[PDB]
């Protein structure tokens, strides 16, 4: 009756895709072959799972999603992993040679060979929608597939789907940690392109979730397979209304009505709570306000730019499992009474809210906490300015020295493009400062009387 698309680009996308689809299978009772031999149901039809899976004539479900990197290897891994028979063969799309962390391979000289073969697979998934709602697209800024091709695809989706929601889910660059030397060309060449083609663009940070993993999941060895499993708890909580019925449902196209005050201000940061080990879970009763207050702690953010350096301005705040709207009401109001938690004076309406009856699942891989109720949150803030303040000067240093620019140019670009991208990123620098303005009073100004 309603449907959406998920899309997984570059080696960051394809892997956060596994965690998500691992979960969604497990959450819905769908197996690694696409079956659901799982609940002795007597009624059916929604079954809101159909929004994310296509049903087959003999009861197999198939994921409404598409994979891409520009070499096979990371995809051959899924293709031969436990979900080989789960995922649709022709939705698993592959190049030969990877984009090398070079945006110009991803957007321009390689990208151009497989873009229409992705778009063909995607028009052929809209013909399975009964009403295409939108798109949820997973990448990183540091990969050159993850930057170049995600922004090629957003060029192309913003025509073929020009009204629908294009929602991004980035691994965003850490403050002190990096995964490419060419990290700044990618971050800015993708952000400058999507800055007119995407609806929302949510951030998670590996430097931030490592410390959550050592601190509060109490894990010594946080792998990317563990960390992508923690990131998956935010994605399942953000989609809960489109997965299950609830006291207070939210639409795919509601987040941006509430979170994006001006169309360029589309960087809400993401989070989950409560993050515990099983042994800690026993020393917390976890009432709704405890989760809520914890979820607001700066050291509990899944982006490492500190909210102590900025005002908050727009939130969406989402609850799962055993939850009473009266507790949500009070715990929200508790956080506002604590205006110590700094927020913009000119949006006291700073929250949207959603409450879903279905509790979370953990993907087993340790001792299990006995969870009852949970919280996830999206927040727009000027701490994102604190993050970008360096990535910006890194682009200034790289570009002033013309370091690496002959790889990108050779593979489909001109220096004037590096200038425009940075120029708009200098406009965007002033945009997150304009939303930091404590505005002047307008009361008590008059003309005097005519005689």
């Amino acid at each position: 009756m309603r449907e959406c698309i998920s899309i997984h680009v570059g080696q960051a996308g394809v892997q956060i895709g596994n965690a998500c689809w691992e979960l969604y299978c497990l959450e819905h009772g769908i197996q690694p072959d696409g079956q659901m031999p799982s609940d002795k149901t007597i009624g059916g039809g929604d079954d809101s799972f159909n929004t994310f899976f296509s049903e087959t004539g003999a009861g197999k479900h198939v994921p409404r999603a598409v994979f891409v990197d520009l070499e096979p290897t990371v995809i051959d891994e899924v293709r031969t992993g436990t979900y080989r028979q789960l995922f649709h063969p022709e939705q698993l799309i592959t190049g030969k040679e990877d984009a090398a962390n070079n945006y110009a391979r991803g957007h321009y000289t390689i990208g151009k060979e497989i873009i229409d073969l992705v778009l063909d697979r995607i028009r052929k998934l809209a013909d399975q929608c009964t009403g295409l709602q939108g798109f949820l697209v997973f990448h990183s800024f540091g990969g050159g597939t993850g930057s170049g091709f995600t922004s090629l695809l957003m060029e192309r989706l913003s025509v073929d789907y020009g009204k629908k929601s294009k929602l991004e889910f980035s691994i965003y660059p850490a403050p002190q940690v990096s995964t490419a030397v060419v990290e700044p060309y990618n971050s800015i060449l993708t952000t400058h392109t999507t800055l007119e083609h995407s609806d929302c663009a949510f951030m998670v940070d590996n430097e931030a979730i490592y410390d959550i993993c050592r601190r509060n999941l109490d894990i010594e060895r946080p792998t990317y397979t563990n960390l992508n499993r923690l990131i998956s708890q935010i994605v399942s909580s953000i989609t809960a209304s489109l997965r299950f019925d609830g006291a207070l449902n939210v639409d795919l196209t509601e987040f941006q009505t509430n979170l994006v005050p001006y169309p360029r201000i589309h960087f809400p940061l993401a989070t989950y709570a409560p993050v515990i080990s099983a042994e800690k879970a026993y020393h917390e009763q976890l009432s709704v306000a405890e989760i809520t207050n914890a979820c607001f702690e700066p050291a509990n953010q899944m982006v490492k730019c500190d909210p102590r350096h900025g005002k908050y301005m727009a939130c969406c705040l989402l609850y799962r499992g055993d939850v009473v709207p009266k507790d949500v009401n009070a715990a929200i109001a508790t956080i506002k009474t604590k205006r110590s938690i700094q927020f913009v004076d000119w949006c006291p309406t700073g929250f949207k809210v959603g409450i879903n009856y279905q509790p979370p699942t953990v993907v087993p891989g340790g001792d299990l906490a006995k969870v009852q109720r949970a919280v996830c949150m999206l927040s727009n803030t000027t701490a994102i300015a604190e993050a970008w303040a360096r990535l910006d000067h890194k682009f200034d240093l790289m570009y002033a020295k013309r370091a690496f620019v002959h790889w990108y140019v050779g593979e489909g670009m001109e220096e004037g493009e590096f200038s425009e991208a940075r120029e708009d990123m200098a406009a965007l620098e002033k945009d997150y400062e304009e939303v930091g303005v404590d505005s002047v009073e307008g009361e008590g100004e008059e003309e005097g009387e005519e005689y």
Binding site: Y262, A426, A427, D431, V435, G442, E443, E445
Partner: protein
């Protein structure tokens, strides 16, 4: 252009409060600045 912000952050700052309006009151109130002829009132004794 040496670069500037692109968001409409203060586009309505020329407008002012409020928070009340009018009020409608007995001292006039239906009139306009050009409704000519049709002299007051009242017959030629009050006066013409």
């Amino acid at each position: 252009d040496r670069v500037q912000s692109k968001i409409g952050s203060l586009d309505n700052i020329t407008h002012v409060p409020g928070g009340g309006n009018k009020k409608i009151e007995t001292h006039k109130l239906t009139f306009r600045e050009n409704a000519k002829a049709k002299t007051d009132h009242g017959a030629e004794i009050v006066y013409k």
